[PDB]
Design a protein around this nucleic acid. Structure first.
Lengths: 140, 51, 549, 83, 37
RNA sequence: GCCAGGAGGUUGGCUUAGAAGCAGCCAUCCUUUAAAGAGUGCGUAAUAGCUCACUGGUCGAGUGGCGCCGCGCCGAAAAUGA
C-alpha cells in the first residue's frame, strides 16, 4: 500500500534493467522502466539517447508519474571540442579546441543544474573542468 | 474485476471485510493518468470517489 | 530447544518465496508438547504420554482455541482464490465442511501451490497418525500425476497413461548390488503391466531380456508379486546388461523410447597415481561397477601425459567413493593434485643457425637450415610463412622439415614440454639433389628448432581458464574476495537468472576446485563451470622450483 | 536467566547453570530471562562485579552471543578467515 | 606484534601508557598490541 | 564535548571487467558560502555509506604544537646459592 515511494535514478534512453534500486523501491511500485526507455526516447530524440536522472512516484495505491533531468558535462565538452573521449593526464596534453569561444554556448544550453543558479559565476568552474577533461581552453 | 487485477491483496484479503464491504481508493489525474479514470469506472463498475 | 510455528512459516518465503499455508497448531513450546490442535477439522488432538497407546482429544482448555480462529480463518481465504464455490462462500460466512474442503486443498496440494504444514515430533511419537492421515487426505497417487515425459520410436510424443491394459511402456532406474540374489534394479513401470514370468526388451542397448522375478522390498520383510501394475512400482530380479536410467519396453511393446535426460556434471577434479599401478586394473573394473551403476563421475584419462583424470560433482562425493576404495577393492593409491598441461613459448625472434649436412662417402642425405622464427601473443594460435627466396629448397623439402619443427615441438627443450602461440618464418637454406633427403631435412627442422628454443629466451604458460560463478551477493563479496585471491582476474558482471553471476579468468593451477569453497561461503547455492581460454606465464619465478631437474 | 530464590541462575552456552549470590550494597531484579538488572549503591561494586558478569561470559566473537552490559559486537569473518 | 624495544602508533586508536612498569601500546584493533621488551 | 551542513559540475582526467574523494597514475578550477577539501581515514565487487578538514552557534577560561638543559624509564636472557 506504499505511502510515497517516489524514486529517481541514473538511466539514459535505452537501457532497461529493473534491478535494484529499481527492484526494492520501484519494483514495489510496479512502475514501467520499460516504458521509460521507450517513451523517454521520444521526448529526447536529439541523439535518441542521453544520460538523464529519472524519477517515478507511487501514490497511496499505485499511481505513476515519471520525471527527468540533464546529461553530463563530460559530453557537452566532448562532442564539441574534438576530444573524442579521453586525453590522458589532463594537464600536460592540450588536444581539443574549446577555447574562450564555444564555451559560451556549451555553458548556455545547460541552466537548471550546475551549482551557481546563474550563468556568470561557475562558468569558471566550466572553464576549469575542460582542463580536467584534458582539453585546451586556449585564450581567445 | 478490480480485486483480482489492481488490488494486490488477492480477492479475499483486500476485501477481507466483505462481511460489510468497507474499502475505497484508486488514484487518478488529468491528461496522463486517465487510465484509472474511465476504464475502471466505465467497464460496468462503480467507484464514485472523484473521477 | 526452539519449538516453532512462527520462524518456520517465516523461513519458507525467506529462502525461496512461495505461499505456504498451514493446517494445524502446536500446543506450546519446546518440551512443552502434548499434541496438535488442528485448524482443519478444528480439534485438539494429543497423546499426553509421549507414545501413542494412551492418546486423547481432551477438551481444549480455552488457552489458544480463540487464537486458532485467526489462524484457522486463513484457510477459508485461500480457497477464495482457486475454487468456484469459495469465492462466494468466503463472502457468505457459511461453514465449509470437508466436502469441497478436501477437494479445494487437494486441488492446491497437487497443483504445486500449498504447504499444509503438518508436523508433530518423533521419539516423541507426535505427528504419527496425524500425518499418516493427513498424507492420505492430501498426498496424491498416479491419478493426478501427469504423463511422465517419454519419447517415441520415430521422434514425437505420447502420454504415459496408467492404462492397465494397453501399450507396455517401462522404466527402471536403480542398479543395486544385492547379496541374496544379485544385480537388482528398482523400477517404475509407467504403462502396460508385467508378469513375474515374461521377457521385455532393453530399448537403449538391445536385449529382449528375461524378467525372472518381480517383487517389493517391504518393511521388516519382503513381499513378492507375480505381476506389476501400470503406474505402480517395484523391484526386478534379472537383467545383466542395462544401465542406471535406460529406456525400457516390454515384449508386447514395439521398441519405443524414453527421455529423462538429466545432468550429473563433474565439478571437483583430483587425479590418481597408485602404488606401482599394480591395482589400476582392479580399480578400472571397479569403475565398471561404478561409472555405470551410478554414472555420476568421469574417468577421463589424462588428455595429455601419464596420469588418468577422475572427475566428479561434489567433493566428499569423491571421498565416499575413495572410501569404497580401501574396503571392497582394498587398493592403495595417491590421489594427487593434477600436474600441469604444459606448453612453452618465447618473446623474442632470432636468426638461428641449424645444421645436418652430413654424409661420409657414397650416400648423401644433407640437412642445412638457416631459419628465422617469431612467436605470437598468448592464446591466438599457430601459423607460419613460406619465405622462399627464389625456390631454394622446393619439392619434398617443405612439409617433412616443417614436421621437423613439430617433432622438436612435442618435447620443449627445458623439460620436454610443448610450445604454442607462434609464427615461425625461416628464410634460407642449402642442400643437394641426390645428396639430400626427406628425414634429413626433417631433422634439419628438429635441430634448428631445438637451438631456436634453448638459446632464445625460455618461458612456459600455465593453463588459464574462464568461469561463471552462479551466486547470491553477500558471498558475491566473499567469493570475489578469494577469486582475486587466486592469482587472476575475473572480468564479468551481469545480474543473472535469480541473482548475480560473475565471469572470471582464473588459472587452474591456482583455480583448481572451488565447489568445496563455493559451498563454504554460499552455504550451497549455485556453482561454477570450467571454460578454457589458453595459458599465461607463472610470474617468471614460480617456475624455478618447477625447473627441478 | 532466572530470579529464582533471590539470585542469579542462568545458562549462556554452558551446560552447568551459573549461580550468583548478591553481596551487601545491592538488591536483585530479573524481568524477562533475556535481560537482567541489579539495583545497588557503589560505583566500585557497580563496574567491578558487572564486568565480572561480562566475565561470566565473553561477548560476540565472530558473530554475536554472550553478555554485554550494553556493549556492541564487531564481526570477524567466519566463513573463511581461518585457512 | 607483542614485545619489542621500539613501539609506535599507526592509527589514532594507537596510544602509549605507563602502568606497573614499562611502556604499553594499545589500539582499537588489539592486533596492534605491543610492549617494550 | 554538542545540533548542522559537511555540497555540485565530478563518477575530475585516465585506465579499467567496473575503479565513483577514495587501487592507482596525471593531477591545483570554481561555484549556493557561515561552510565543505578535484577530499582524511574507514567502507562496497566498484556505488551507497561512517567520516574528518571547513563553519556558525551552544559555552566558559585558557589551550594545543615546536626548539631547548638536567635526573629517572625501557632496550636487559645462563648454567653451585646470593
Amino acid at each position: 500500500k506504499k505511502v510515497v515511494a517516489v524514486v529517481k535514478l541514473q538511466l539514459p534512453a535505452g537501457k532497461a534493467t529493473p534491478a535494484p534500486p529499481v527492484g526494492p523501491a520501484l519494483g514495489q511500485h510496479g512502475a514501467n522502466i520499460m516504458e521509460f526507455v521507450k517513451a523517454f526516447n521520444a521526448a529526447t530524440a536529439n541523439m535518441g539517447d542521453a544520460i538523464v536522472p529519472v524519477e517515478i512516484t507511487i501514490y497511496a495505491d499505485r499511481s505513476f508519474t515519471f520525471v527527468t533531468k540533464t546529461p553530463p558535462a563530460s559530453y557537452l565538452i566532448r562532442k564539441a571540442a574534438g576530444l573524442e573521449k579521453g586525453a590522458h593526464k589532463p594537464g600536460r596534453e592540450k588536444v581539443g579546441r574549446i577555447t574562450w569561444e564555444q564555451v559560451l554556448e556549451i555553458a548556455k544550453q545547460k541552466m537548471p543544474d550546475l551549482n551557481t543558479t546563474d550563468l556568470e559565476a561557475a562558468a569558471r568552474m566550466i572553464a576549469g573542468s575542460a582542463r580536467s577533461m584534458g582539453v585546451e581552453v586556449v585564450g581567445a | 474485476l478490480e480485486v483480482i487485477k489492481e488490488l494486490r491483496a488477492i480477492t479475499g484479503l483486500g476485501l477481507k471485510e466483505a462481511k460489510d464491504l468497507a474499502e475505497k481508493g484508486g488514484p487518478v489525474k488529468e491528461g496522463v493518468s486517465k487510465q484509472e479514470a474511465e476504464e475502471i469506472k466505465k467497464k460496468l463498475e462503480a467507484v464514485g470517489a472523484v473521477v | 530447544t526452539g519449538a516453532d510455528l512462527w520462524l518456520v512459516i517465516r523461513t519458507m518465503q525467506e529462502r525461496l518465496g512461495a505461499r505456504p499455508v498451514v493446517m494445524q497448531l502446536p500446543i506450546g513450546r519446546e518440551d512443552t508438547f502434548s499434541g496438535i490442535i488442528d485448524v482443519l477439522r478444528m480439534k485438539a488432538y494429543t497423546y499426553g504420554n509421549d507414545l501413542g497407546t494412551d492418546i486423547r482429544e481432551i477438551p481444549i482448555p480455552e488457552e489458544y482455541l480463540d487464537q486458532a480462529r485467526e489462524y484457522h480463518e486463513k484457510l477459508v481465504e485461500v480457497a477464495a482464490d482457486f475454487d468456484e464455490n469459495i469465492m462466494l462462500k468466503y463472502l457468505e460466512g457459511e461453514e465449509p465442511t470437508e466436502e469441497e474442503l478436501v477437494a479445494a486443498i487437494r486441488k492446491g496440494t497437487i497443483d504445486l501451490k500449498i504447504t499444509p504444514v503438518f508436523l508433530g515430533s518423533a521419539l516423541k511419537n507426535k505427528g504419527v497418525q496425524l500425518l499418516l492421515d493427513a498424507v492420505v487426505d492430501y498426498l496424491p497417487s498416479p491419478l493426478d500425476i501427469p504423463p511422465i515425459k517419454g519419447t517415441t520410436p520415430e521422434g514425437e510424443v505420447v502420454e504415459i497413461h496408467p492404462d492397465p491394459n494397453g501399450p507396455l511402456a517401462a522404466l527402471a532406474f536403480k542398479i543395486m548390488a544385492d547379496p541374496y540374489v544379485g544385480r537388482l534394479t528398482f523400477i517404475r513401470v509407467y504403462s502396460g503391466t508385467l508378469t513375474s514370468g515374461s521377457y521385455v526388451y532393453n530399448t537403449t542397448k538391445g536385449r529382449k531380456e528375461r524378467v525372472a522375478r518381480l517383487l517389493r522390498m517391504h518393511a521388516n520383510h519382503r513381499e513378492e508379486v507375480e505381476e506389476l501394475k501400470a503406474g505402480d512400482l517395484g523391484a526386478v530380479v534379472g537383467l545383466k546388461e542395462t544401465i542406471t536410467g535406460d529406456t525400457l519396453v516390454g515384449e508386447d511393446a514395439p521398441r519405443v523410447i524414453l527421455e529423462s535426460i538429466e545432468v550429473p556434471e563433474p565439478v571437483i577434479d583430483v587425479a590418481i597415481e597408485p602404488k606401482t599401478k599394480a591395482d589400476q586394473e582392479k580399480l578400472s573394473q571397479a569403475l565398471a561397477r561404478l561409472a555405470e551403476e551410478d554414472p555420476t563421475f568421469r574417468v577421463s584419462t589424462h588428455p595429455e601425459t601419464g596420469q588418468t583424470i577422475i572427475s566428479g560433482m561434489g567433493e566428499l562425493h569423491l571421498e565416499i567413493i575413495v572410501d569404497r576404495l580401501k574396503r571392497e577393492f582394498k587398493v592403495d593409491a595417491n590421489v594427487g593434485k593434477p600436474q600441469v598441461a604444459y606448453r612453452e613459448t618465447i618473446t623474442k625472434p632470432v636468426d638461428v643457425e641449424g645444421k645436418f649436412i652430413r654424409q661420409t662417402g657414397g650416400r648423401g642425405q644433407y640437412g642445412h637450415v638457416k631459419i628465422k622464427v617469431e612467436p605470437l601473443p598468448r592464446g591466438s594460435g599457430f601459423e607460419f610463412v613460406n619465405a622462399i627466396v627464389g625456390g631454394v629448397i622446393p619439392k619434398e623439402y617443405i612439409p617433412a622439415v616443417q614436421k621437423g619443427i613439430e617433432e622438436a615441438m612435442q618435447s620443449g627443450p627445458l623439460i620436454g614440454f610443448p610450445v604454442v602461440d607462434i609464427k615461425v618464418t625461416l628464410y634460407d637454406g642449402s642442400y643437394h639433389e641426390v645428396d639430400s633427403s626427406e628425414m634429413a631435412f626433417k631433422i634439419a627442422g628438429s635441430m634448428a628448432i631445438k637451438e631456436a628454443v634453448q638459446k632464445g629466451d625460455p618461458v612456459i604458460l600455465e593453463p588459464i581458464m574462464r568461469v561463471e560463478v552462479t551466486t547470491p551477493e553477500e558471498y558475491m563479496g566473499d567469493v570475489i574476495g578469494d577469486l582475486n585471491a587466486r592469482r587472476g582476474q575475473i572480468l564479468g558482471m551481469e545480474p543473472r537468472g535469480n541473482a548475480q553471476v560473475i565471469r572470471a579468468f582464473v588459472p587452474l593451477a591456482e583455480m583448481f576446485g572451488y565447489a568445496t569453497d563455493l559451498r563454504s561461503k554460499t552455504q550451497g547455492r549455485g556453482s561454477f563451470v570450467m571454460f578454457f581460454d589458453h595459458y599465461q606465464e607463472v610470474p617468471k619465478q614460480v617456475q624455478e622450483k618447477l625447473i627441478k631437474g | 536467566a532466572r530470579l529464582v530464590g533471590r539470585a542469579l541462575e542462568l545458562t549462556v552456552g554452558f551446560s552447568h547453570p551459573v549461580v550468583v549470590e548478591p553481596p551487601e550494597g545491592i538488591t536483585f531484579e530479573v524481568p524477562e530471562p533475556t535481560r537482567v538488572r541489579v539495583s545497588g549503591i557503589d560505583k566500585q561494586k557497580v563496574g567491578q562485579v558487572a564486568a565480572n558478569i561480562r566475565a561470566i561470559r565473553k561477548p560476540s566473537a565472530y558473530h554475536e552471543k554472550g553478555i554485554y552490559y550494553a556493549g556492541e559486537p564487531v564481526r570477524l569473518k567466519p566463513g573463511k578467515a581461518g585457512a | 606484534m607483542k614485545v619489542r624495544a621500539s613501539v609506535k602508533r599507526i592509527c589514532d586508536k594507537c596510544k602509549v601508557i605507563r602502568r606497573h612498569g614499562r611502556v604499553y601500546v594499545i589500539c582499537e584493533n588489539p592486533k596492534h598490541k605491543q610492549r617494550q621488551g
